[PDB]
Amino acid sequence: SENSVETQEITTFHDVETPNRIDTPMAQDTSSARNMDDTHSIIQFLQRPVLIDNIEIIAGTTADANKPLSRYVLDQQNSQKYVRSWTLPSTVLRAGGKAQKLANFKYLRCDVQVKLVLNANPFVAGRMYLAYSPYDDKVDTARSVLQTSRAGVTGYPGVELDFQLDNSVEMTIPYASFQEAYDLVTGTEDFVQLYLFPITPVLGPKSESESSKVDISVYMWLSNISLVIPTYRINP
């Protein structure tokens, strides 16, 4: 009669009395959408793998995709040559429609998974290396992966990427930032910044009209997430 303080998700009210609320006579169950699928939570929804990139290699090669790793890097013009650059988590959040499903939240504590499905013919050899380097375009110039030697590139954490032995890799890129719980509104996140390096050049028969392809693909999804503070904004 005096105490009407009820609680919604994140919302509380303050009335004089309980305002004479009427409702359903009996809450009988109806159409069977509950019996067709269980409800997917928002921590369950940010664990779906997405098709991000589709990298094709031909050897070849006129392009930069088969320049091998330099044994020495003597100057910043002749930096280390790579394939692609994924600037996590700003790539994994925008793709797959995730950012239009974690809107109206503020802080995030994620761990990015990376999987490489690989599919090449038996008549082609080679080897790559999938290194990640946190703050790789924030730290001073000499400390980045793109300026060190071949022994220094491979010494970074990662996994071997041989063709005939590995058709799938599982790498767990950790929560690797100094700030507690990544900001989203006015976001400049870009903490861990991934790379893909070829160690040996891709090898095939030197006669052409043969089409020695590689066709890498990249899957990423989050893990061990905690999504906490509600807001009204978001970056587009």
């Binding site: 994140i10 004089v16 503020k106 700030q179 507690e180 503070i229 509600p230 807001t231 009204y232």
Partner: protein
């Protein structure tokens, strides 16, 4: 009976007053007294309280009025009270200061001195000493109404960057961005008070913003030039904007008052030095407006 010396050579460093800026450790200050065991009594029968009157749990647990609002029938709904306060409807959650008044005197025919004068809540006044803070804030919003004023009033949190207006000498909030229908209040933590018979509410806001400690700069040197420290000091703002307009008959007055109290519980601080670009100068009110205040400088 007079043997030779058996002790080793004691090494040595000549440091008079080694580590004087620490509250623990035996200090070499000579007492100018009769007894070396000079012991004052305990705190019995001296101060007429029994509460330990210096713990930060009690000093910062002292309520102070910050804002006095005037909520009118002229003012619209779903829009905070913009009154020339200038903060008023947008109270920044956080322990250090956020407001300032500027005193403009004259020196020559074309030169003036603009001295920033700040108000000081006791939660604010302790935080000026220390550099980095972390505290669970509190606010007790009270409506000063008659028996006949009714309505519904909303207070909602928002974490992060506060909307501002940088000026030449001060920072004002920006009520162009908090109106509408351009900034909804449907996903924030909120409380919808009722002016029918309920009057007061205390809204405890714990500390959550992506860092272990914020800064205690606040509004010192906050202007168009230097306003990084103002953003990294609060974890957002409360916002008092009305859901439903004030319903008042012609007998009672159309103006009600909203008094915003402030304190801070569970306070912890980091360094015993001021983070500001100036010493802790306490403002002494001059007798006549033509007189100026002595300024502490930074040479040694």
């Amino acid at each position: 009976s007079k043997p030779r010396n058996q002790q080793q050579v004691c090494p040595l460093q000549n440091v008079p007053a080694w580590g004087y800026s620490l509250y623990k450790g035996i200090d070499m200050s000579v007492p100018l007294a009769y007894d070396p065991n000079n012991e004052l009594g305990d705190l019995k029968d001296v101060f007429p309280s029994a509460v330990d009157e210096m713990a930060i749990g009690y000093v910062c647990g002292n309520p102070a009025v910050k804002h006095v609002l005037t909520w009118k029938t002229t003012d619209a709904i779903q829009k905070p009270i913009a009154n020339g306060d200038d903060w008023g409807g947008v109270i920044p959650v956080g322990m250090p200061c956020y407001s300032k008044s500027i005193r403009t005197t004259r020196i020559s025919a074309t030169e003036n001195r603009e001295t920033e004068v700040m108000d000081a809540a006791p939660c604010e006044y302790v935080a000026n000493m220390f550099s980095y803070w972390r505290a669970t804030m509190c606010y007790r919003i009270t409506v000063v109404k008659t028996a006949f004023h009714t309505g519904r009033l909303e207070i909602f949190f928002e974490p992060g960057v506060i909307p501002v207006k940088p000026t030449v000498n001060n920072i004002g909030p920006d009520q162009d961005r908090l109106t509408g229908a351009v900034a909804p209040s449907d996903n924030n933590y909120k409380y919808i008070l009722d002016l029918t018979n309920d009057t007061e509410v205390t809204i405890r806001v714990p500390f959550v913003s992506n860092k272990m400690f914020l800064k205690t700069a606040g509004i010192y040197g906050a202007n168009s030039e230097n306003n990084w420290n103002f953003h990294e000091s609060f974890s957002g703002f409360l916002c008092i904007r009305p859901v439903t307009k004030l319903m008042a008959p012609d007998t009672v007055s159309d103006n009600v008052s909203i008094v915003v109290w402030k304190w801070a519980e569970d306070v912890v601080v980091v360094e015993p030095k001021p983070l500001t670009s100036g010493p802790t100068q306490v403002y002494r009110p001059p007798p006549t407006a033509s007189t100026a205040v002595e300024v502490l400088n930074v040479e040694l």
